[PDB]
Design a protein around this ligand. Structure first.
Ligand SMILES: Nc1ncnc2c1ncn2[C@@H]1O[C@H](COP(=O)(O)OP(=O)(O)OP(=O)(O)O)[C@@H](O)[C@H]1O
Ligand SMILES: [Mg+2]
Lengths: 53, 53, 53, 45
């Protein structure tokens, strides 16, 4: 966790996780193009063993 | 810069009465140059000389 | 961050630095002062509803 | 010509006007150029 590589790899794991069903939630505020902000429900793979292809 | 030994660094200073467009111009310039902004707070509590370097 | 409304109050406006209250940090300054004739009339009418004006 | 008139009137009324104050003044008169060009005197210090 001491490397920026950790941040980039965590982001890539969040994006490319196929249909992984062992996720964890991460709430963030996303500013829409209309000018307002709404809650964004983002799912990060929860701790465990996940398999990709 | 390399061919003359000069360090490859540059710094800019914008000064004037408040509300005249320094921060807004910096944001616009960062947008134009497709750069990002690293906000540094000198008057912090965890900031030391070695940490600043 | 955008989409944000900030309300600030004070009793001594002369103690506020002009950079803190400027058109872009505080977009509206209003004075809430002592009672006036109309204000007293409305307060009386609200506290004792039914009496003659 | 309206922009030139507005600039001249603002410079005549006040001597040191910051762009933030001009932005706020325009914020008051949204979609009303004539109101902006009319009520310069409200900007007097
Ligand atoms: N030249 C300008 N053109 C357009 N908008 C401006 C200009 N100068 C200031 N503003 C507006 O004023 C507000 C605040 O300006 P800004 O933050 O750039 O001021 P500043 O002088 O850099 O002050 P500070 O250093 O305290 O941030 C914003 O709404 C910004 O759009
Ligand atoms: Mg600034």
């Amino acid at each position: 966790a001491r490397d920026r590589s950790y941040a980039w790899l965590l982001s890539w794991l969040t994006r490319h996780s196929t249909r992984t069903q062992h996720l964890s939630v991460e709430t963030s505020y996303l500013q829409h193009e209309s000018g307002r902000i709404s809650t964004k429900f983002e799912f990060i793979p929860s701790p465990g063993n996940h398999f990709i292809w | 810069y390399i061919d003359r030994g000069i360090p490859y660094r540059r710094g800019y200073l914008l000064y004037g009465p408040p509300g005249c467009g320094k921060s807004s111009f910096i944001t616009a310039l960062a947008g134009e140059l497709e750069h990002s902004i690293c906000l540094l707070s000198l008057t912090d509590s965890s900031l030391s000389d070695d940490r600043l370097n | 961050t955008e989409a944000r409304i900030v309300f600030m109050t004070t009793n001594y406006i002369d103690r506020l630095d002009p950079a803190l209250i400027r058109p872009g940090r505080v977009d509206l300054k209003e004075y809430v002062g002592y009672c006036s004739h109309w204000q007293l009339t409305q307060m009386f009418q609200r506290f004792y509803p039914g009496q003659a004006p | 010509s309206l922009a030139e008139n507005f600039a001249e009137h603002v410079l005549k009324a006040t001597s040191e006007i910051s762009p933030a104050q001009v932005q706020g003044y325009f914020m008051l008169y949204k979609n009303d150029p004539m109101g902006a060009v009319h009520n310069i005197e409200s900007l007097r210090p």
